Each structure stands twice: as C-alpha cells, then as structure tokens.
Design an enzyme around this catalytic site. Structure first.
Site, PDB file in Angstrom:
ATOM      1  N   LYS A  88      -2.072  26.218  15.521  1.00  0.00           N
ATOM      2  CA  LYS A  88      -0.964  27.019  14.998  1.00  0.00           C
ATOM      3  C   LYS A  88       0.332  26.218  15.162  1.00  0.00           C
ATOM      4  O   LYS A  88       0.630  25.748  16.223  1.00  0.00           O
ATOM      5  CB  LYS A  88      -0.821  28.386  15.662  1.00  0.00           C
ATOM      6  CG  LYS A  88       0.058  29.354  14.840  1.00  0.00           C
ATOM      7  CD  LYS A  88      -0.563  29.920  13.622  1.00  0.00           C
ATOM      8  CE  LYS A  88      -1.210  31.293  13.763  1.00  0.00           C
ATOM      9  NZ  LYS A  88      -2.133  31.584  12.637  1.00  0.00           N
TER      10      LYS A  88
ATOM     11  N   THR B 275      -6.648  30.394  14.888  1.00  0.00           N
ATOM     12  CA  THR B 275      -5.249  29.989  15.094  1.00  0.00           C
ATOM     13  C   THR B 275      -4.365  31.166  15.525  1.00  0.00           C
ATOM     14  O   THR B 275      -3.461  31.017  16.332  1.00  0.00           O
ATOM     15  CB  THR B 275      -4.646  29.284  13.856  1.00  0.00           C
ATOM     16  OG1 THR B 275      -4.508  30.197  12.758  1.00  0.00           O
ATOM     17  CG2 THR B 275      -5.558  28.179  13.355  1.00  0.00           C
TER      18      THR B 275
ATOM     19  N   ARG C 172      34.482  -1.606  12.114  1.00  0.00           N
ATOM     20  CA  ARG C 172      33.868  -0.645  11.227  1.00  0.00           C
ATOM     21  C   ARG C 172      33.636   0.666  12.034  1.00  0.00           C
ATOM     22  O   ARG C 172      33.713   0.691  13.253  1.00  0.00           O
ATOM     23  CB  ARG C 172      32.539  -1.086  10.641  1.00  0.00           C
ATOM     24  CG  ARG C 172      31.430  -1.249  11.657  1.00  0.00           C
ATOM     25  CD  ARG C 172      30.120  -1.766  11.105  1.00  0.00           C
ATOM     26  NE  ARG C 172      29.107  -1.705  12.177  1.00  0.00           N
ATOM     27  CZ  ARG C 172      27.819  -1.889  11.917  1.00  0.00           C
ATOM     28  NH1 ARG C 172      27.311  -2.161  10.746  1.00  0.00           N
ATOM     29  NH2 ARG C 172      26.968  -1.784  12.959  1.00  0.00           N
TER      30      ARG C 172
ATOM     31  N   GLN D   9      21.280  -2.395  16.976  1.00  0.00           N
ATOM     32  CA  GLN D   9      20.203  -3.023  17.762  1.00  0.00           C
ATOM     33  C   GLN D   9      20.638  -3.257  19.184  1.00  0.00           C
ATOM     34  O   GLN D   9      19.969  -2.848  20.090  1.00  0.00           O
ATOM     35  CB  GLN D   9      19.793  -4.334  17.115  1.00  0.00           C
ATOM     36  CG  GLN D   9      19.037  -4.270  15.832  1.00  0.00           C
ATOM     37  CD  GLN D   9      19.798  -4.171  14.525  1.00  0.00           C
ATOM     38  OE1 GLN D   9      20.950  -3.717  14.536  1.00  0.00           O
ATOM     39  NE2 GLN D   9      19.149  -4.524  13.411  1.00  0.00           N
TER      40      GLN D   9
ATOM     41  N   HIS E  86      26.319   5.216   6.846  1.00  0.00           N
ATOM     42  CA  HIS E  86      27.416   4.345   6.423  1.00  0.00           C
ATOM     43  C   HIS E  86      28.661   5.092   5.959  1.00  0.00           C
ATOM     44  O   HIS E  86      28.566   6.092   5.262  1.00  0.00           O
ATOM     45  CB  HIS E  86      26.951   3.403   5.320  1.00  0.00           C
ATOM     46  CG  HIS E  86      25.703   2.617   5.657  1.00  0.00           C
ATOM     47  ND1 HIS E  86      25.657   1.645   6.632  1.00  0.00           N
ATOM     48  CD2 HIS E  86      24.449   2.695   5.170  1.00  0.00           C
ATOM     49  CE1 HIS E  86      24.409   1.172   6.655  1.00  0.00           C
ATOM     50  NE2 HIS E  86      23.646   1.774   5.806  1.00  0.00           N
TER      51      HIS E  86
HETATM   52  O1  LIG Z   1      24.182  -2.592  13.174  1.00  0.00           O
HETATM   53  C1  LIG Z   1      23.744  -2.959  12.125  1.00  0.00           C
HETATM   54  N1  LIG Z   1      22.492  -3.527  12.010  1.00  0.00           N
HETATM   55  C2  LIG Z   1      21.856  -3.973  10.886  1.00  0.00           C
HETATM   56  O2  LIG Z   1      20.725  -4.479  10.960  1.00  0.00           O
HETATM   57  C3  LIG Z   1      22.658  -3.876   9.687  1.00  0.00           C
HETATM   58  N2  LIG Z   1      22.406  -4.254   8.442  1.00  0.00           N
HETATM   59  C4  LIG Z   1      23.441  -3.802   7.802  1.00  0.00           C
HETATM   60  N3  LIG Z   1      23.771  -3.900   6.508  1.00  0.00           N
HETATM   61  O3  LIG Z   1      23.555  -4.914   5.799  1.00  0.00           O
HETATM   62  O4  LIG Z   1      24.391  -2.948   5.950  1.00  0.00           O
HETATM   63  N4  LIG Z   1      24.404  -3.208   8.541  1.00  0.00           N
HETATM   64  C5  LIG Z   1      23.881  -3.228   9.825  1.00  0.00           C
HETATM   65  N5  LIG Z   1      24.486  -2.835  10.943  1.00  0.00           N
HETATM   66  O1  LIG Z   2      -9.479  28.984   7.476  1.00  0.00           O
HETATM   67  C1  LIG Z   2      -9.075  29.320   8.548  1.00  0.00           C
HETATM   68  N1  LIG Z   2      -9.253  28.546   9.676  1.00  0.00           N
HETATM   69  C2  LIG Z   2      -8.833  28.789  10.954  1.00  0.00           C
HETATM   70  O2  LIG Z   2      -9.094  27.989  11.866  1.00  0.00           O
HETATM   71  C3  LIG Z   2      -8.172  30.065  11.116  1.00  0.00           C
HETATM   72  N2  LIG Z   2      -7.689  30.660  12.197  1.00  0.00           N
HETATM   73  C4  LIG Z   2      -7.118  31.714  11.699  1.00  0.00           C
HETATM   74  N3  LIG Z   2      -6.479  32.722  12.306  1.00  0.00           N
HETATM   75  O3  LIG Z   2      -6.820  33.212  13.410  1.00  0.00           O
HETATM   76  O4  LIG Z   2      -5.496  33.274  11.729  1.00  0.00           O
HETATM   77  N4  LIG Z   2      -7.244  31.905  10.367  1.00  0.00           N
HETATM   78  C5  LIG Z   2      -7.940  30.781   9.947  1.00  0.00           C
HETATM   79  N5  LIG Z   2      -8.393  30.532   8.721  1.00  0.00           N
END
Ligand SMILES: O=c1[nH]c(=O)c2[nH]c([N+](=O)[O-])nc2[nH]1
Ligand SMILES: O=c1[nH]c(=O)c2[nH]c([N+](=O)[O-])nc2[nH]1
Ligand SMILES: O=c1[nH]c(=O)c2[nH]c([N+](=O)[O-])nc2[nH]1
Ligand SMILES: O=c1[nH]c(=O)c2[nH]c([N+](=O)[O-])nc2[nH]1
Ligand code: NA
Ligand code: NA
Ligand code: NA
Ligand code: NA
EC number: 1.7.3.3
Lengths: 295, 295, 295, 295
Positions: free
Chosen positions: D10, D57, D176, D228, D256
């Site tokens: 779920k 589920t 920047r 980086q 940017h």
């Molecule tokens: O901090 C940055 N790392 C990058 O690898 C990078 N590449 C680009 N860029 O080309 O826009 N800006 C960046 N600025």
């Molecule tokens: O096709 C289904 N599989 C499940 O494993 C399942 N479990 C529940 N359920 O309890 O709601 N409905 C379901 N329907």
C-alpha cells in the site's frame, strides 16, 4: 572523506524537432524531455575545486541540440545511444553517460476524415521513455518503457482467497472495478556499442507497439484474479514475442473505486449487483510490482 | 461589519457511475469531479454561530451521490441542473446553487478492431465541463466548456505587422510554430428552470461536438495571422451553428517554441528555412482572450 | 458576430530583483511571477487580422523587466500600479491594464543566530499577491491577498447544531481537528491614479502584516463553532484596523481529518476521547467563502 | 517465464497522530505519508492466481494505523523499523518489508510571542524522510533524508575554469546567483534488528538536525567554486559528526537565474556589476550528484 560515486549534467532539456517532406509537404513533429548525466574522472571537481574536469552542463545542453540537428531523434533508443556514445568518445576522462528521454505525444490530426499535413494533438499524457546507459568498456544498456497509460474496466475483475487474520477487514469480491496507470519496462540484452543498437533499429518501435498492444488486450480480456496475475500474463507474452528482451517489469497502482451504501436513504440499493454509483479514491492505493524473466 | 456575499459547500467530490445494458452486456462508464456551493439566508452562520441554517457539506456530498443514483449523469448540463434545482427547492432558505462539474474521459477501447464491452482508456486530460448556476427566481444559467485540448501546428502560423517601438525586440515572422491548450466556453441563453433545460437535452452533446470540431478544423486549416484572428473565426462559426448560445469565450496560451541558432557550432544552419530543432519554452507565455457575441 | 470583451498579454513572467547596500554589503532579494493583460481598441486584431493595434506580448515582457529595473518592486501594490499605469499612458489605444503579481518568499537565513547578508530560504509556498486593475478614466482598483497559508489546530474546533434531515449522516462533534489553506483578500478603496497609490505606500505592508497576524491569532485562539464563524471574526478585525479597505474576502477549505475506528482489532479504542490516529482526507473537502464589508 | 523480483503493498497512506499531555494541555501533532511494500514467497500470486499468499493491501493499511496507535511515530526511523519488523515476524512467508515515510511539517505557532498549545503551521514543503528496508536474515537498512529545502544566495558563488571546446558557449563568472532544492541522504550502518535501532534512537533526530545545520551554514558561508565543491564540504562535515553514518548523498539542481541585457533600451545597464533584474529559468536545470564515504 572520499567520493564513492558522482554524476552530473543537464536535466529537463525540452527538445522539439520537425521533419518536412519536400515532395509531399507532410510535416512530422517529435518532442521530448532529455536528461544527460555523466560519470568519469571528475572527483576532483568535488574535492579540490578543480573545474577543469567539468564539461559544463550548459555545454551538455548545447550538445543535445546539436546531436538532434545532426541525427534522427527516433526511435528514442537510437537517439539516446548516439548521444551517450558521443560523450564517452569525445571526452577521454568521461567513462559513462546516462541518458533519459521522455517522448511526448503529438499525433497527427484527422480533419474531415483525412490526415492533416502539419497539425497535431496531444492524445494523452501517456509517455514513451528510454533509459540508455553508455558505459565505457561495457556497451550500452537500454530500458524502454511506456508510462501514464490510464485504463479502467468496469467488471471482469475479482479479488478473493487472500489471507485473512486479525488485521483483515476487506470483503472478498467476485466483481469489482479495476483501474490503473500502466508503467511497463522492457530491458534489452546488453549491446556492445552503437553499431549493435543500429543493427536492431526496427525492433524498438515494434517492441513498444507489442508491449502496448499486449497490455491493452490482456487488461481488457483477462477475467482478472488479481493485479498480480494479470500483469504476469502481460509480461510473459511480451517476452515470448521479442527474444532480445531479457526482462519485463510492471509497476501498477490499484486505483480503488469504493461502493457507496445508500440504504440509509429511502432504502436505496447501490451495493453488489445494484451498485451503480461509486466513490473513486485518490489515496491510498495498492501498488503492485513484478520483474519477469525467462525460465 | 456585515456579510456582503457568502457561499459554502463541498468541492472535489469524485463520482463514478456505470450503466449496464441487460440485453447486450455492454457497460458504459462516467466519471466526474463535482463542486456544489450554496447561497441563501445563511449569514447568521457567520455572524452569530447559528449552524441551524447550514445544510452540512457532508450532506451536500451525500446528495450528490443520491442524485447520481436516481438520475442520468449525462449530459453534465442536465445533471448539474437537476442537482442545483434540488437544493433551492428542498431548502426554503437556500436561494442559489452553484454546480461545477469536470467530466473525465473514459473512451471505450477497441481490441482487435472491435469495441470492448467494459474496458476504457483515458485518451487525454482534455475535460468537458459545466458551470450551472441555479438561482431562485432567475432560472438556470449554464456555461459549457472544453479545456485541456492541447494542439500544435508546425507551419501556417504567422505574426507580423505588430506595433514596434522602443520596447520591441521581437522579429516579425511569416512561418512559426503555434501550440496552445484550448479553453473554450459557450454561454447558453438563460433557462427558466429545469423543464426548459430538459427540453434542450440533445443540444448539449451536439454543441460540445460542434465546438470541438470547429476548434480543431479551424486550428488546422487557418493560415493564422495571430492567435487573436484564429480564435475569433472559431467563435463566429460556433455562434452561427447554435442559436441558443449567446457568447463564445476562448482563453488560449501561446506556448512558445523558440528557434535555436547553432551557427556558432561548425556553421550549422538551424534558423529560418533551415530550422529543424527548437526549444519549447515552459514560461513565460502569451495569453490571449476573447468573448464573442452576436452583432 | 462581434467582440464583446477582449484582453491579451504575457502570463507567467518570472522576475527576480536584488538590492545591494554599498555601505553594509547586505543584499535583499525579491522574486515574483507577473501577468499583464491589456484591453483597449484592439478588436480589429481579432476581426480583421490587424496586428497594428497589438503591443506584442514579448514587448509586454520586456516592459516588465525594464519597469523592475527602473522602480522598486515592493510593495507589490505599488509595482503593479506603476506597471499598469505605464501601459495606459504610453499607448493611446490601450485603456486598461490588468496586473497580477505572485510574490515568492525569500526569507533571510539566520546562521549561528545572526542574519546572513546574502543567503535566503523559501519558508513555505505561502504567497503574497496583488491584482491591480488600472482603467483609463476610472483609477486603480487593487485587491491584495495572502494564499497558501496552511494551518492545523488539534482541538478547540466544534461543529454541531447544523440542519439534520433525510440527507444527513454526519455526527455532531464538540472536539475535532480543523485544518485549512488560508486565501484572504482585502479590497482597497478605489485610487484615483498612481499618485494616490504612492501616498499610501506604508499601508500596504502594514495591512498585509495585520491580515496575517489576525488570521493566525484568531485561528489559534477561537474556540471555533464553524469555519463560517471563525473566518467572519478574522474579517471583522481586519476591517476595524484599516479604514482604507472596503471588504475582506476569505476562501477556506475544510481539509478533513477522519477518526479511525479500530475497535474491530483487539478492542482498540481510537475514537472520541481516545482518538489519537486519524486519516487525513485528500478529497472531497468543504469549501467556505465569505465577503465581509462595513455595516 | 519466471518471476525474478516482486513486491507489493500500500502506497500513499496518509497518517496523523496527536499526543495530548494531561498535565499541561500541550498537544503535539505528527503527519506522514507511508508506503509499505512486501517481498517473500509470493510468486504464485502472479503465476498461478494463488491469492492465499497475499496479505491484502487493505490489511497493510490497517496495520499501519494499528502500529501508529500502539507505538511512537517519531523518530520516523524507529516507526519504520517497528512497522517493517512486524511484517517479517508476523508472516512466515514474508521475508522483506520496505517502508518509506514522508514526514510533513507541523510547526507549533507562536502567538503574541508565546508557543500555542494546539495550533500549528506548515512552514514549507521541506520534508524529512526515511527508507527502511527490513530484510529477514539481514537486519535493517535505513536511509534518512531531508528534501525540498529550497535556498538562494545572491552572491559568493562562482563558476570558471571549466572545460572549453567547440560545444561551449557559457561565459565564465566570478559572481552569480546560486539556488537549489536540497535533497540530502545519510545512510546508516546496517542494524542487526529492531533492538539495535532502538538503542540509537536519540541519534536520529540529532543527525537530521546536524545535516540540516551543516547544509544551511555551508551553503551560506562557502564562497562556492561550484555546486560540486560546496556539496562535498557539506557531506564531509556530516560524516565527521556521526560515526554511525556510512555515506552522505546529495542531489542538487542548479536552478538558473539568467542576466537580462537591457542595453538595447535606452542604454540600460543590467549586466555584470550593474545586474539587478534577472530571469529565473524553470528549465532546463543542471543536476549535480555525489555519494561521499569515508577514506
Ligand atoms: O556549479 C556548477 N557546476 C556545473 O557543473 C555547471 N555547469 C554549468 N553550466 O554550464 O551551466 N554551470 C555549472 N555550475
Ligand atoms: O489485485 C489486487 N491485489 C492485491 O494484492 C490487493 N490487496 C487488496 N486490498 O486489500 O485492497 N486489493 C488487492 N487487489
Ligand atoms: O498570435 C500572437 N499574438 C500576440 O499578441 C503575440 N505577441 C507575441 N509576442 O510578442 O511574442 N506573439 C504573439 N503572437
Ligand atoms: O465548519 C464547518 N462548516 C460546515 O459548513 C460544515 N459542513 C460540514 N460537514 O458536514 O462535513 N462540516 C463543516 N464544518
Ligand atoms: Na571517454
Ligand atoms: Na429555496
Ligand atoms: Na491609453
Ligand atoms: Na517472515
């Protein structure tokens, strides 16, 4: 202290490209969002303020545009591979390039039943994506995916037979709504370099089509025992239809639709067979994941 | 101090409804998000802590579900009118009900080329909406709209001849990309009550279809002089095709796609006729609005 | 057809400005998002493709930056008024300018207990906004607001005595959680032009401070009978503390926190006086609005 | 085909808890969003429609609430560990529990300069998070983080000395703006089980405080050579102040702020030393990552 891992680059680079056919006047558009992160002998930029080892992220951006100008941007597996290969080949000290691409839909419009030469519609936020890891000495690792494919079926979904103990309140059901947002990934065999990627280019669009087709047909036709059981059927079929894929991964939310008991009001019957109006639940949601490989 | 205006209610009420055809087994789904805000003789809840005048927002929620159980939820203009009428008729001291509905797309899937009886896809976040104001003594005022319809054309858009002064840097262009998210609203003649709304029910789906059709065809086919000039053509046609609409309003962003000069790199030519790769701009954006009525 | 209303301009213009004190080396930053939409004798741009009447939206953008370079950007009521006045005075055929400003928080950091000369933190997405409508012949209409102020009180909220009928299921309560996102707007007396705005400049920061102060103290201290009753107390106090405001408007969601009955599990008591763990509900939500003026 | 990996559970479970001091009447609130995903001998739910292996589920959801009722929800490292341990101990066939917690800020209000006993404010969307992986046989692996801490410094950031080639257009700068959203993660020594987590409980709040403190002071005071170089200084200090952490990971966007050349307009000087008004760029953005360990 010491650097154990480091990567850096440019994220959220929006890219459009147009192709214009001279003979016919038919235009085709492509739009993506690109991220490129580099690894290599760059640790001294972190530890010693040595910027000489940095390919500026702005230069990475420029390179994305230049590469798109000089090469096809489709299929995205190919574009990603060209782009990543560029960085590890151009820069001796860069040893890996990690390229993520999100492809946005621009589907040609049909106007008066005929396809329009230069007008397009975004028919959903469904995306086609790639993750391309180009690693010096270790080829090219590609994960292809479709995501944001939102579906609902109004019957032919069940969920019963689950474990019941002192934490359990959920009622078993033989007829429920099933809705999800499909995230499906196929992981390719490692490629030895750009040439091998090139050699398989038609398989990328074909495998994306198969994955989408299998997903939709299995969702629509499976009288589903669970999300688990249905997604496994999808994965098995995709593996059977492309030998160059090693695994298929699904990540599916169960987007719950709850019955609404209205019997407190004039004895209205809106549950079980009489259920017509439901409350879609925004949260919480089940989350079901599987990675399927070959036996 | 004194209350000059007040309204209250329940927002963000998610509603699903299913229709099941017994003869055929074909299911049809509807999903919406509903807001209902009430006005009336309620000022003392604000000024004197007198909650006796409050129809609890939870009860408003319940009423939405009950109304959906007992009535068609389509067209949303009708559902909204039924819902708003309920509140002003049921409660003597409530004199207006303001109903907003967002309809979500659940389009039937085609599997192997045949429409599937109970499986659906969200083909975009495009919405169909209504704003229904039910005012005691003054009938029902309805604004219908489509929104989130995202389109792009790759040529046959121009923008030249605009005012040029000491604040102006923009270059005139005879061939640019045009992309927008369409928000189009048609405002109906005032209706005297629920019966008159009922009498026009087929016109709501037909006018939504016309508005969508006109929008797409005019966008695709207009060799556009400006967003202003194109949107006006859309509005005029919709008014000419439904006499019961009084005005059509468009709100269109100009989602800019900028050329990228690459001539600094190996003399690459990517501008004017050679422009292939563009930078989609997330912000800022032009915003163009018009309300068109009859002469 | 005919144009009934039209406005156009540039939206989502992000603006930063820095002030550097030469004597002291203390820097102060300001950041906003600006929208400017113009009205005037512009209808022919829509109906006749006549772009000569258009001040390009790109030029509007440039003008925003230029105006920020040449004038204080604080208080935003002043900046907005300068900006709007520029357009109706510079362009004979432009007769109204609608300026919306969203101010983003950049609060000076305290490091080791001393305020830092050039480092800032975004302490929440709470915004301070203005809507400035500069209309030729009709002065300057300003609406000031704070929004996105998210608060919770864990007791000293009640809701009982509301109308009960066949649509009602909500239980009366004498002790509940109350949480909301505060959207509060004070509407100024009409100003005859830019000079009158200038004459009141200190009142803008003071009235924003009062509104925020009153909101927080009344929310914290009121043993609340309803959202309606509490918000009215806030509005009345703000009106009593600034005679140049005509109305105060609140729009408050009731962001529900539901009890969770756990008595089905080992007889755990988690309701009423024993309630400790709750389920915050994302949707639906009550929505309560009031506009308060003077008697 | 075969299952290679699987987990399910779920997601998006919203949880509030209140503590009420009887002696003093001081209330304290906690709010989180929880995800629990389980692994184990569950493959047959996927391959053979065997739901007997599924802890529903919905039952997982219930268990989250019950666990919150019966235990402290702070520090989140502890709560997460209790919760994950429950699942692998209660269910023989469940062998791992993956618990993610997002903690939301509810900071006590000061009213008239005194802390209020039951009223709180969301002072930003900054989150405190944990990822707790409880794996049968392999103890408890915890990653703690802070995220969404948005900061800006208006000077004392530089970027020069980077690689310059035919892809490079960026101008070197000695002054920047630097702004980022801080995502910082400290990875704990593996814990052998819940008892060892318990034994270290005070270290979780202390290490989160140190990480935040170091981050803010180093950002404010470093005459930065690059993102980086600055982030590395932060990581080294945190490692030096908590021996039970093995690595510190930062993920920082470079958000940017571009200069705006206005010299085309009346010779306005707004670049270099005269730069006052800037254009914040929403996308693209540099993305800088480092994982720092001990030498
Ligand atoms: O901090 C940055 N790392 C990058 O690898 C990078 N590449 C680009 N860029 O080309 O826009 N800006 C960046 N600025
Ligand atoms: O096709 C289904 N599989 C499940 O494993 C399942 N479990 C529940 N359920 O309890 O709601 N409905 C379901 N329907
Ligand atoms: O269609 C358009 N209308 C406008 O009013 C406009 N203004 C600008 N512009 O300067 O960018 N492009 C525009 N394109
Ligand atoms: O303060 C409140 N005002 C309302 O009008 C209201 N209605 C409901 N409700 O039924 O949930 N809670 C409410 N709480
Ligand atoms: Na290399
Ligand atoms: Na009435
Ligand atoms: Na004028
Ligand atoms: Na176990």
């Amino acid at each position: 202290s010491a650097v154990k891992a480091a990567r850096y680059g440019k994220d959220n680079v929006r890219v459009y490209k147009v192709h214009k056919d001279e003979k016919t006047g038919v235009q085709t558009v492509y739009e993506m969002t690109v991220c490129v992160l580099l690894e290599g002998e760059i640790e001294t930029s972190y530890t010693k303020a040595d910027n000489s080892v940095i390919v500026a992220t702005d230069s990475i951006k420029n390179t994305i545009y230049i590469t798109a100008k000089q090469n096809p941007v489709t299929p995205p597996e190919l574009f990603g591979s060209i782009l990543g290969t560029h960085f590890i080949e151009k820069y001796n000290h860069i040893h890996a390039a990690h390229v993520n691409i999100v492809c946005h839909r621009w589907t040609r419009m049909d106007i008066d039943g005929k396809p329009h030469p230069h007008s397009f519609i975004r028919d959903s936020e469904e995306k086609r994506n790639v993750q391309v890891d180009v690693v010096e000495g270790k080829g090219i690792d590609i994960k292809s995916s479709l995501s944001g494919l939102t579906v609902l079926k109004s019957t032919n979904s069940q969920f019963w037979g689950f474990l019941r103990d002192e934490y359990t309140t959920l009622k078993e059901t033989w007829d429920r709504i099933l809705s999800t947002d499909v995230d499906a990934t196929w992981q390719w065999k490692n490629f030895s370099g750009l040439q091998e990627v090139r050699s398989h280019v038609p398989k990328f669009d074909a495998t994306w089509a198969t994955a989408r087709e299998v997903t939709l047909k299995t969702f629509a036709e499976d009288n589903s025992a669970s999300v688990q059981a249905t997604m496994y059927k999808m994965a098995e079929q995709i593996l059977a239809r492309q030998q160059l894929i090693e695994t298929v991964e699904y990540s599916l939310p169960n987007k719950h639709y709850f019955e609404i008991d209205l019997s407190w009001h004039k004895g209205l019957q809106n549950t079980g067979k009489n259920a017509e109006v439901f409350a879609p639940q925004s949260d919480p949601n089940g989350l079901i994941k599987c990675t399927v490989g070959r036996s």
